[PDB]
Write a protein that binds this ligand. Structure first.
Ligand SMILES: Cc1ccc2cc1NC(=O)CNC(=O)CCCNC(=O)Cc1ccc(cc1)NC(=O)[C@@H](NC(=O)[C@H]1CC[C@H](CN)CC1)Cc1ccc-2cc1
Length: 246
């Protein structure tokens, strides 16, 4: 009974990270915590293969040395990690060559694929997530007084097409075609500090596909200020090349 990508063994709860709700433990088995060698959380990430983790390039601004990074897998807590939690060192860092906010980490050893550690599925190249598509963002980031501090939280957010997101009342032309927007324009529900590099997944047919990587925003959960995510579809060819070649 191998574990197919995108299919959690613990069905994700829905609560239709600031706002949202604490997730069912192990409902997001591709969620990774990027940590200092001393075990401090400072970014999220997504397991896409037993030996590969995808995150935001900005998460690596403090050090270009792989030895400076540790990956936490199968976790729900941020500080009191449970016993089965896998901790794996990084061997090589691969930054996107067009200066985009995405990067791949090759783990020193392959992660053990369990019912609590399963890779996410990648989208088909150039796929454009439709406007209003409900997707989920996950992370151990700040809650801004919304509850769930120190625990893996989730939030279901509608995707906002770039044409709307780039309007003057919103991000005013700051969003690129290699990026996507997601959030409640009314505010209240949004990724926040510590969620960068983490996943934005959408349910497709019977599984979750990685469509976005938490990147940046004008504050968190502010009205008319949706969060910005790197569009994974525009980088699937590059990601597969790196993994096949290295
Ligand atoms: C070692 C290191 C590596 C990388 C970062 C920080 C450190 N930290 C230090 O260098 C000195 N502190 C230590 O060593 C203690 C290490 C442990 N905790 C900390 O630092 C505290 C800590 C501080 C800051 C962060 C994470 C952790 N994050 C961020 O804000 C990252 N944006 C986002 O999340 C955005 C996502 C989208 C959202 C829009 N809705 C807006 C926010 C941008 C970002 C900024 C900094 C880093 C990573 C990402």
């Amino acid at each position: 009974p191998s574990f197919d990508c995108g299919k959690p063994q613990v069905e994700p709860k829905k609560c239709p990270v600031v706002g949202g709700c604490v997730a069912h433990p192990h409902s997001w088995p591709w969620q990774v915590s990027l940590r200092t060698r001393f075990g401090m959380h400072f970014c999220g990430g997504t397991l896409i293969s037993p030996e590969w983790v995808l995150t935001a390039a900005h998460c690596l601004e403090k050090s270009p040395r792989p030895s400076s990074y540790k990956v936490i897998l199968g976790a729900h807590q941020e500080v009191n990690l449970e016993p089965h939690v896998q901790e794996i060192e990084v061997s090589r860092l691969f930054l996107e060559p067009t200066r985009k906010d995405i990067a791949l980490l090759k783990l020193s050893s392959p992660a053990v694929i369990t019912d609590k550690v399963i890779p996410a599925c990648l989208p088909s190249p150039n796929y454009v997530v439709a406007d209003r598509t409900e997707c989920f963002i996950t992370g151990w980031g700040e809650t801004q007084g919304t509850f769930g501090a120190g625990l893996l939280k989730e939030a279901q957010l509608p995707v906002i097409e770039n044409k709307v997101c780039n309007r003057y009342e919103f991000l005013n032309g700051r969003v690129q075609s290699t990026e996507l927007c997601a959030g409640h324009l009314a505010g209240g529900t949004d990724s926040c500090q510590g969620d960068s590099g983490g996943p934005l997944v959408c349910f497709e047919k019977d599984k979750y596909i990685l469509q976005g990587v938490t990147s940046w925003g004008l504050g968190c959960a502010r009205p008319n200020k949706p969060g910005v995510y790197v569009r994974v579809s525009r980088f699937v060819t590059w990601i597969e090349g790196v993994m096949r070649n290295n």
